[PDB]
A = this chain, B = another copy of it.
C-alpha cells in the first residue's frame, strides 16, 4: 500500500469562541417529574472558512439531544468557532487540518459550553465523550497511519 502521513504543517490558534449557542428546556417544570432515562444523541459537523491567506476559521457544530421517551429532556447545540492560521500543507492534508485537527481543538470548548448550559438548566452534569476527529478523517483518508518506537536508552 502507500502510507500518506501529513508533514510540514503550521498551526496557530488566533481566537477560539462561540459563534452560535442553543440550549432548550421548554418542558422544564414537568420534565423534572420525569424518570431520568435520557436518550443523549451526540452529532458532529465541521465547516471551515477562508478568512484570509493561510487564515482559516473552523466551526464545530456539536448537537446534543436528550429525550425521556416521548417527552424531551433538553437540546444543547453549540457552534464552537475558532479562527486558526494554517499553512505548510494543501489538498487532502489541508482537509486533514481543517476537517480533523481543527474541530478536535474546538471539541473541549464545545463540550464545556454544552455542559455549562445543562448544569445551569439544573439537569445532572453532562460531559461529551472524547472524540478523535483525526481518527474520523483517517477513516475516509485510507485507514493507514502509525508512529511510535519507544526504546529505553538511558544510563
Contacts and interface: CB of A to CB of B under 8 A. Distances in A.
Contacts of A7: 132, 135
A16 B151 contact: no
A15 B32 contact: yes
A44 interface: no
Interface in A135-151: 135, 138, 143-151
A60 to B, nearest CB: 12
A26 interface: yes
B149 A4 contact: yes
Interface of A: 1-5, 7, 11-26, 28-30, 32, 49, 51, 57, 81, 83, 91-92, 104-105, 107-109, 111-113, 115-125, 127, 129-130, 132, 135, 138, 143-155
